[PDB]
Design a protein around this ligand. Sequence first.
Ligand SMILES: NC(=O)c1ccc[n+]([C@@H]2O[C@H](COP(=O)([O-])OP(=O)(O)OC[C@H]3O[C@@H](n4cnc5c(N)ncnc54)[C@H](OP(=O)(O)O)[C@@H]3O)[C@@H](O)[C@H]2O)c1
Ligand SMILES: NC(=O)c1ccc[n+]([C@@H]2O[C@H](COP(=O)([O-])OP(=O)(O)OC[C@H]3O[C@@H](n4cnc5c(N)ncnc54)[C@H](OP(=O)(O)O)[C@@H]3O)[C@@H](O)[C@H]2O)c1
Ligand SMILES: NC(=O)c1ccc[n+]([C@@H]2O[C@H](COP(=O)([O-])OP(=O)(O)OC[C@H]3O[C@@H](n4cnc5c(N)ncnc54)[C@H](OP(=O)(O)O)[C@@H]3O)[C@@H](O)[C@H]2O)c1
Ligand SMILES: NC(=O)c1ccc[n+]([C@@H]2O[C@H](COP(=O)([O-])OP(=O)(O)OC[C@H]3O[C@@H](n4cnc5c(N)ncnc54)[C@H](OP(=O)(O)O)[C@@H]3O)[C@@H](O)[C@H]2O)c1
Ligand SMILES: Nc1cc(SCc2ccccc2)nc(N)n1
Ligand SMILES: Nc1cc(SCc2ccccc2)nc(N)n1
Ligand SMILES: Nc1cc(SCc2ccccc2)nc(N)n1
Ligand SMILES: Nc1cc(SCc2ccccc2)nc(N)n1
Lengths: 253, 251, 252, 253
Amino acid sequence: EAPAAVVTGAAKRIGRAIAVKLHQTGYRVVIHYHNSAEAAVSLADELNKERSNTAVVCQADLTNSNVLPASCEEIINSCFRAFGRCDVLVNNASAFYPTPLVQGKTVETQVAELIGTNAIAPFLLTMSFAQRQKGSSNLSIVNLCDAMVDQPCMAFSLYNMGKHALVGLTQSAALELAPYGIRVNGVAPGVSLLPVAMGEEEKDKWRRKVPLGRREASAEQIADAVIFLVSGSAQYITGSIIKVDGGLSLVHA
Amino acid sequence: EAPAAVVTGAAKRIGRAIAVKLHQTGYRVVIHYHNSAEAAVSLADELNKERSNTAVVCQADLTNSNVLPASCEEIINSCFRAFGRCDVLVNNASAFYPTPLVQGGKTVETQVAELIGTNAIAPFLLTMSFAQRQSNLSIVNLCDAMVDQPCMAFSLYNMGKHALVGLTQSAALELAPYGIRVNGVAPGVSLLPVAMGEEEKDKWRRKVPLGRREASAEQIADAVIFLVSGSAQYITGSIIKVDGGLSLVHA
Amino acid sequence: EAPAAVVTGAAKRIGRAIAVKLHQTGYRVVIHYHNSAEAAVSLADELNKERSNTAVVCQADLTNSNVLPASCEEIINSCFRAFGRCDVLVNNASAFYPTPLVQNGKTVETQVAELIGTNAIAPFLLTMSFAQRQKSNLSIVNLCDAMVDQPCMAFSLYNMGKHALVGLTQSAALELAPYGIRVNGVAPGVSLLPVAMGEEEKDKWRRKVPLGRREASAEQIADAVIFLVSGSAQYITGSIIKVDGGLSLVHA
Amino acid sequence: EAPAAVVTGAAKRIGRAIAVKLHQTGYRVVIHYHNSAEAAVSLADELNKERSNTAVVCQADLTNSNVLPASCEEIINSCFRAFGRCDVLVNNASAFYPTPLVQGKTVETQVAELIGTNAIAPFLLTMSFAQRQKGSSNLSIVNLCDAMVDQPCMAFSLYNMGKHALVGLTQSAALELAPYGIRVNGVAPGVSLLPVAMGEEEKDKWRRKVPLGRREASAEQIADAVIFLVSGSAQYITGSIIKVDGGLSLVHA
Ligand SMILES: NC(=O)c1ccc[n+]([C@@H]2O[C@H](COP(=O)([O-])OP(=O)(O)OC[C@H]3O[C@@H](n4cnc5c(N)ncnc54)[C@H](OP(=O)(O)O)[C@@H]3O)[C@@H](O)[C@H]2O)c1
Ligand SMILES: NC(=O)c1ccc[n+]([C@@H]2O[C@H](COP(=O)([O-])OP(=O)(O)OC[C@H]3O[C@@H](n4cnc5c(N)ncnc54)[C@H](OP(=O)(O)O)[C@@H]3O)[C@@H](O)[C@H]2O)c1
Ligand SMILES: NC(=O)c1ccc[n+]([C@@H]2O[C@H](COP(=O)([O-])OP(=O)(O)OC[C@H]3O[C@@H](n4cnc5c(N)ncnc54)[C@H](OP(=O)(O)O)[C@@H]3O)[C@@H](O)[C@H]2O)c1
Ligand SMILES: NC(=O)c1ccc[n+]([C@@H]2O[C@H](COP(=O)([O-])OP(=O)(O)OC[C@H]3O[C@@H](n4cnc5c(N)ncnc54)[C@H](OP(=O)(O)O)[C@@H]3O)[C@@H](O)[C@H]2O)c1
Ligand SMILES: Nc1cc(SCc2ccccc2)nc(N)n1
Ligand SMILES: Nc1cc(SCc2ccccc2)nc(N)n1
Ligand SMILES: Nc1cc(SCc2ccccc2)nc(N)n1
Ligand SMILES: Nc1cc(SCc2ccccc2)nc(N)n1
């Protein structure tokens, strides 16, 4: 029987690339999304045309709130409902925007979005993933981290806090879930897919910083590291975060 | 004239030792507390006996909520009101307890609010208010030398402390142009929990390479005092372990 | 045509498993060895039985000395002479023994030479020679140590060598990126234990490992090397992959 | 009676400021030097003018060789000869120059000088320091590290290797010497005193990168962190490396 994977924020960009590569490797996939319903359905249609009944979509907001735990339980339940199992969880979904310390979202919304998506939802999804594992096995979680966590973007404190918290989770969860045979790793992009609304000049400013090829990672390149970590070739690997950054983090100011 | 400092969770233990040393150094102090009003006032009385009108108290819950930003704004405002200035912020207050990932009291979302609130969100909001309201200005965040070798089933706590490292670095960068330095002190084992039994205490003590004992609260405060001093005027984004080598010790 | 790899200290244990997995992946291999000539030759015979003319052996001492740069140049040259190319270098060979700060036959300068030479200087000189011969998926993989920041008592020179190797991995990734040469690391925690180590001591190490209370096989370490030299790692440079079963996360 | 300190490479620059500040704190000092004999003797003169018989010079090459252990032993011996005790060792002396990987001194002498000064000499000095401790007391070692070790300068491999090895030594020696009450820490400058050979435009380019003040650290600012680490206010601190970098290491490419 084919294993099954949940990928959060999988409608487009890195999340889609991960869903696609997992699908190509023989996984059934839950394509979680928030707003990008058309994109998500379009992806699921493509994947189901390749192999029938191997992809479903699952809508949820991952902003922190008192219902977030129920929402995360439901995402995992959706994988079991569709496929009867849940072998892999990929925490990809992420809010990303500045929160300057000095000067229409309230600061409490910002906290709920940036810390919820990047850290609390991963934690709750990890809880639910583990709790459901009830009656060979290759169970794992991959968290999408950030190679620049220690050289952060100016004015991105809450975003960076959430990514740092995700490193914490990756390590704490690896330790705690090891006895259940669930590995927990991370993949840390440098610059991959630039924002759709970023101008070309600004894109190039980033590209030129990258030692290896002076270009951003393809979405596939990021997906490759994920696929490695979920594979049998990584069965002794847990609590590791693999940078996929073309040397960007090694470059001084 | 004298500089002024805010210390969160200053009524007891490490926070109390920090407030005391900052006061001995010549600071006026705001002693923040949540539940420990008696101890907060007793400390303020002691410091005020030494130098009149140099210590005040400030109550607040630092759990994340809809009202936390206003609470944090008021803590900073209390310092300006009492003393006309705020030169130093010490983010010491902290919730600490386990949050197992798997189940065999508090809801998980209350746990998130308390652990991520006290250890990360409140420090962020306080940092915001401190900066907005502005010489040797600095912030010191009480971190945790064991962040990368965490205690089993403490994922939320550890996440909060990791977030606090991120805040420390991000705020150091962003606040450098304003001349506000932002650093951390990372204890290993200092004052053991009051509810911990003596046998467990000795088990932790024996792990510590340097003297096989826990750090006094004074020894933690010493690192804080260095970081806020003129001797650290070029230091920002730095986290000083004060752990007697505990973090270097393998399983 | 088939790519070629140099693996240092490839006669036995982890280096052997790396050489074998590379071979299985389609590489021709230079099996470097110091003292284990019989094991090196037996491996080369095995590999050439599988595919003729796909394995050769290369003897060299990688202790630091005046002649080490020449020795390292010759190891790289051996790959070119045998196979006409050198696509992968794996820096695996390593001296490992205690060097207490306060006090067997060795002088301290010999201990420096052996520990810093094998773990850091020889990898640097090999990296220089590898790069200089580059006139495509070229990469270098350094065998690091996941416990580099929680070191074993009285292993200062060893640990200094392994820290130096992290610095090399990073510096060489940056410098060699314009040549399209990737440089990465694999950091085992506990993998193959010494055969003579008593089982009681072995089991002490095993029980520390969160994931399965066992050491890594050599093959598991090799798997990470194979990923890093592959087309699935084309954007990965300056990264050190821990393969430690969570051992480095475990507090004292 | 007064404690005694050895500072390597103490004739000029950072090492000189360290020796001066230790002396102002009440230490007697061994001013180690290699080529800067005139400056070393001058500094000893100034300190002895302040308090007679509180400073001596000690000449040594700290390049790696078969005689390096003897030379290191002799430095420590010189502190005991002069002052009857050795409480503090500051490993400051450092060779610093590029060693490109792709194509003066032979590569073997570059290894000897860069790895010798930055790593092997510290190690041998640490051995000799610990061994000589015959046996209020506040023994410690401070290693001058580099805040940019993970964001190194292009074509400085051997230098960066030596400084990485020095981090390892700091950690290993902290662990091993803790039972003897010897603390072992580091101070990691970012940009402090710029090379005398560096041109003015280039100096200003480095200054511009520093978030805190857009200026290099003074030697006295670096010495202040050393003074802290050797003091009674750092009694529980061992195996710690304190960055003194004005935020430079936090700044992305
Ligand atoms: N792109 C890069 O260069 C880069 C660099 C470093 C790290 N990363 C990390 O890699 C991952 C993927 O990056 P990316 O650029 O592909 O991500 P992205 O496009 O910025 O966001 C991915 C998805 O996150 C989902 N999301 C945002 N807010 C959400 C919410 N409140 N609830 C539920 N889902 C929400 C969105 O889903 P809908 O569209 O369905 O609303 C969105 O499509 C992220 O974790 C990111 O931080 C990326
Ligand atoms: N003790 C150690 O060995 C150790 C080790 C590593 C790190 N640290 C860090 O060092 C700092 C001091 O440690 P400690 O042991 O002295 O701390 P602690 O006694 O556990 O807590 C200090 C204070 O935090 C305040 N606090 C807790 N929850 C709060 C809330 N919801 N709102 C506002 N305040 C709240 C409490 O104030 P009230 O009493 O007034 O309610 C408490 O007295 C903490 O940041 C801690 O994580 C300590
Ligand atoms: N095994 C582990 O648990 C573990 C843990 C952490 C890191 N690692 C790292 O992983 C790598 C493989 O480990 P391993 O246990 O397989 O290594 P190992 O058996 O201790 O040594 C590998 C080979 O290194 C070669 N070597 C030693 N001294 C040499 C010298 N002077 N010149 C040339 N070669 C020399 C020897 O070759 P000859 O036999 O031909 O003389 C030896 O067989 C090493 O880099 C090690 O540090 C291993
Ligand atoms: N300056 C910076 O911005 C900066 C940045 C990061 C880290 N650091 C570190 O801080 C420390 C001090 O920096 P600095 O700039 O003051 O150093 P420096 O001027 O470059 O060198 C200090 C001294 O090292 C001695 N030295 C060089 N080679 C030697 C050898 N072969 N044997 C014995 N001694 C030798 C020289 O003594 P003689 O003059 O007597 O020959 C020299 O004066 C160094 O460890 C450096 O790596 C400095
Ligand atoms: N860290 C990220 C990045 C992105 S878009 C990638 C990017 C944005 C700005 C500058 C350079 C590259 N989206 C998320 N959710 N998280
Ligand atoms: N990290 C901490 C510790 C403490 S109590 C110290 C302690 C607890 C458990 C084992 C050893 C030592 N309080 C807070 N807020 N944060
Ligand atoms: N880190 C190593 C280990 C070994 S032998 C394996 C071993 C593992 C655990 C304890 C003692 C011995 N060889 C090298 N070169 N490097
Ligand atoms: N790391 C160092 C630096 C220096 S001179 C300071 C400098 C050099 C290059 C760029 C900017 C500043 N000397 C030694 N021994 N070690």
